[PDB]
Amino acid sequence: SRVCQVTGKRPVTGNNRSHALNATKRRFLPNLHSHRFWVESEKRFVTLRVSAKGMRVIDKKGIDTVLAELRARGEKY
Amino acid sequence: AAKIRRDDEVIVLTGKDKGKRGKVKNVLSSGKVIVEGINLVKKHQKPVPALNQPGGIVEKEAAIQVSNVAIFNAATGKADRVGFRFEDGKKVRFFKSNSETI
Amino acid sequence: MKAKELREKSVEELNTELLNLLREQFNLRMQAASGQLQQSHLLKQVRRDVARVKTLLNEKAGA
Amino acid sequence: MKRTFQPSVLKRNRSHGFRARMATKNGRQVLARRRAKGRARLTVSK
Amino acid sequence: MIREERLLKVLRAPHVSEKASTAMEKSNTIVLKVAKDATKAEIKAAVQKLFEVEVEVVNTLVVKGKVKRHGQRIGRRSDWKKAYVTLKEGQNL
Amino acid sequence: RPVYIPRPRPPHP
RNA sequence: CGAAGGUGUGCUGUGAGGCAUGCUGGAGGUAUCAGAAGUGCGAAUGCUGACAUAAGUAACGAUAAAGCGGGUGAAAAGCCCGCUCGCCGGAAGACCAAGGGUUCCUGUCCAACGUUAAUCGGGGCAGGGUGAGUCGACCCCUAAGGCGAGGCCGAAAGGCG
RNA sequence: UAAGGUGAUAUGAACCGUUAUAACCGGCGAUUUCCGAAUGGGGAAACCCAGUGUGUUUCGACACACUAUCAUUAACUGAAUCCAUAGGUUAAUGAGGCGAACCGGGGGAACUGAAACAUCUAAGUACCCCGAGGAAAAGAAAUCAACCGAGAUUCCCCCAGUAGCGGCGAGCGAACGGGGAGCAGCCCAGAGCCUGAAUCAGUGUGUGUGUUAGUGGAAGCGUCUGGAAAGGCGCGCGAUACAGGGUGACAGCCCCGUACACAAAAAUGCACAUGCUGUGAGCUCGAUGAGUAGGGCGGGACACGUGGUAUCCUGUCUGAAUAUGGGGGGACCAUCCUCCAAGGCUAAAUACUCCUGACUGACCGAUAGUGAACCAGUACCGUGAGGGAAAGGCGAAAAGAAC
């Protein structure tokens, strides 16, 4: 699914309002992308479907720390 | 805990022939008893070609409600109730009104 | 006819079950079908006896 | 005049049979509803 | 091993009828009722042991119970299996 | 009641 | 030594009603004064059941067709037997598959069912009847297609493979 | 417990038992075919076809056990490249499915109302999906208040159809504060001293109580009517028992019961005392939750529809201070007051009844009451989802009509 593997962002439904305030159901999608991150601890590349915000989160923290949290979450990466 | 048993001499309180004495032969699970010469029914027995050919009219015994018969004291010359008491570890029946054991 | 056979060893229990199944269970059944059996109450009595023996075997063997 | 119903045991079982209902969740709900109603025949049984 | 007791339960009862009688007197074969499963091998072994006779071949068929209309109600009889057992030249029963 | 054995019995033409 | 209900009769009030009683009925009913309503039916092409009308009328389901003798029986145009007549004969014959599910055969019965009668029947009741190494299914193999470990995708369900 | 019994329609045949292993009732055990999550593979459900390992009458052939998937853990193996990893096999643990409502979350209508209709309403309703429990959720202030003060959450009655929101239309609709039910506060982000130090969870023992079988249980007779009295008449007795049901018409005293007093070999829930196991008391110091708060853009939730709009949540792009710091007090600024977000746990009052027991009813009495008082969700109708009836009454007793 369109779920970020780091921040957990998932599509959220909402409305779009016209000038006449007409409301139609829409859906907001996270800015997901497939990226390969190099991990020195295991010395290989890991592919994660992460959002742009998640990629910023990975940069701010360590890739090792994020992987540990993912492992604790219980979902394989 | 049945007050009227297999082998008891009883009297009829209410019915076609009240006051008539007799002895019970069997008791039904529906609270009914059968006695001799109390409730006679002239059943029209059909003939059957089987081994038995009764034919005619048979004077059978009709069951009567257990509540309509009371065990007879046989000493005071009247009907009497029944109570239960434990003696030497066994439950036994006894009369009332100068109660004695059966 | 319940505690008489409680103290017997397993060998006799299997033996008595076999003759209960062999005789008075198969023979009675053939007699009843052919109409030569007049005491039909034996059939149920024999069947219950077989059940009794099997109950003992289970509580003897294994557990 | 050919009529709408042309019986066929194989088609009937493979279409409305018990295993056909259990394949999908909607069929499972169909069985669940009919159990609740107490129907004697859960499905078309051969 | 429950073969002995199994053989004591496959046989249910003999079958009596005009077809049964003519088959016995002519083809030296006995027709009898058996259990619902009653594989041909089990029937053959049971007849050899219980009746102490020699057998040649066994043919089995399944009879479907009839639908009966009892009182205000509809009912069905139970299916049963009958077997034709062909004895050899030496017959006992 | 319900019969469940419509097995095929094709007699040789 | 007779409640409710039912069915008549006689009195009574400007009215909806009330009172007494004959017969059936067979064990419940309820004064007065207050209280609460699923409280009053002639209509809604109202709903359910019962019963009328048309009416003893139309019709009795291919215009291939019947006649007679004997038998059984309470009863015979229809059942059984016999002798004629007529009809189908690339079928209105003999076989299956699919689909029905005992309608198959024997004994017995005629209430209902049969568009009439019925002794007759695919009707009722009872009994009997389906026998495989070679037939078929089962089984080995696969087409369209279905499902689908992992996998890919999808808010969930789930989709595809 | 027991002198009766072998369930019912439903009689019969053949039998068991009567002083104790007949039958019946309760606890604990045994057996428990096949289908169904179905789980060895498959399949048109109740069927077909297997592999491996354990023991056996003619080799023949038999009996039992195991063999699904997924997640976690451990062991052994193990590529593309040395190492390694992926992958594979084995063993253990847990899950799978079903179930009436109530609870939380993820999605989410239209009819209708506005006397049209698009904002709005209907409505976060119906419905679909996911997860857990006996309740769930929420819950110990970055909260209110007003510069006087209260101190977690939840539920009920007020405040109040009030203040506000609103094509300022139809409609929606608080809070502060007050009165009640019930009350309980803690832990981690870390070292030292002292180390069972209270409170908890799991397994033994003992007391009390309750559930699962039960036991005793008072006291009326005579005449009249009558098919039969429990009725009328006359005279008695019981009542810590005239609550009910049955019995040939209306029974406190005929029967079953009722108030009352007792009962448990065995299994069990609850409240205590006493053992074991595991985390864990108390004091000093320090620390005290960052892609977060906030902001731009687009939406949603708060009564509050972007309006002068605070507060919360979020898709997207940015982004601090960290206690001499930060948040809130309804645009916003200054001064004051109050609190300390970005980590968690927590019974009580609250919601519902598929099911079990007792009791009640100015509720129905067979076209009513559940669709179903009669083996009804049946017959029957439909390919299917699904729809869905009609049908109660002899008599006190079959004494159910011999001939």
From Swiss-Prot, chain A:
Pfam families (alphabetical): Ribosomal_L28
One GO cellular component term noted in the UniProt record for this chain: cytoplasm
Keywords, sorted A to Z: Ribonucleoprotein, Ribosomal protein, RNA-binding, rRNA-binding
GO biological process, one term: cytoplasmic translation
Single GO MF descriptor: structural constituent of ribosome
UniProt family annotation: Belongs to the bacterial ribosomal protein bL28 family.
Subunit annotation: Part of the 50S ribosomal subunit.
Protein name: Large ribosomal subunit protein bL28
Organism encoding this protein: Escherichia coli (strain K12)
UniProtKB/Swiss-Prot annotation, chain B:
Origin: domain of life: Bacteria
Lineage: Bacteria, Pseudomonadati, Pseudomonadota, Gammaproteobacteria, Enterobacterales
CDD domains (UniProt xref): KOW_RPL26
Organism: Escherichia coli (strain K12)
The gene coding this protein: rplX
GO molecular function: large ribosomal subunit rRNA binding; structural constituent of ribosome
InterPro entries: KOW, Rib_uL2_dom2, Ribosomal_uL24, Ribosomal_uL24_CS, Ribosomal_uL24_KOW, Translation_prot_SH3-like_sf
Protein name in the entry: Large ribosomal subunit protein uL24
Function, in words: One of two assembly initiator proteins, it binds directly to the 5'-end of the 23S rRNA, where it nucleates assembly of the 50S subunit. It is not thought to be involved in the functions of the mature 50S subunit in vitro. One of the proteins that surrounds the polypeptide exit tunnel on the outside of the subunit.
Xref: Gene3D superfamilies: 2.30.30.30
Pfam families xref list: KOW, ribosomal_L24
Sequence similarity: Belongs to the universal ribosomal protein uL24 family.
Swiss-Prot record, chain D:
A molecular function (GO) term: structural constituent of ribosome
Lineage: Bacteria, Pseudomonadati, Pseudomonadota, Gammaproteobacteria, Enterobacterales
InterPro entries cross-referenced by the UniProt entry: Ribosomal_bL34, Ribosomal_bL34_CS
Family in the record: Belongs to the bacterial ribosomal protein bL34 family.
Protein name per UniProt: Large ribosomal subunit protein bL34
Single GO BP term: cytoplasmic translation
Quaternary structure (record): Part of the 50S ribosomal subunit.
Keyword Ribonucleoprotein among record annotations: yes
Gene: rpmH
Organism: Escherichia coli (strain K12)
Keywords of the record: Ribonucleoprotein, Ribosomal protein
Alphabetical list of PROSITE patterns matching this protein: RIBOSOMAL_L34 (PS00784)
Signal peptide: none
Entry's Gene Ontology cellular component terms: cytoplasm; cytosolic large ribosomal subunit
UniProtKB/Swiss-Prot annotation, chain E:
GO molecular function: rRNA binding; structural constituent of ribosome
Annotated organism of origin: Escherichia coli (strain K12)
One record GO biological process: ribosomal large subunit assembly
Function: One of the early assembly proteins, it binds 23S rRNA; is essential for growth. One of the proteins that surround the polypeptide exit tunnel on the outside of the subunit. Acts as the docking site for trigger factor for Ffh binding to the ribosome (SRP54) and to nascent polypeptide chains.
Oligomeric and partner information: Part of the 50S ribosomal subunit. Contacts protein L29 and trigger factor. Might also contact SecE and probably does contact SecG and SecY when the SecYEG translocation complex is docked with the ribosome.
Entry GO terms, CC: cytoplasm; cytosolic large ribosomal subunit
Keyword entries, A-Z: Ribonucleoprotein, Ribosomal protein, RNA-binding, rRNA-binding
Pfam families per the UniProt record, alphabetical: Ribosomal_L23
Lineage: superkingdom: Bacteria
Name under which the protein is recorded: Large ribosomal subunit protein uL23
Family: Belongs to the universal ribosomal protein uL23 family.
UniProt cross-references to InterPro entries, sorted A to Z: Nucleotide-bd_a/b_plait_sf, Ribosomal_uL23-like, Ribosomal_uL23/eL15/eS24_sf, Ribosomal_uL23_CS
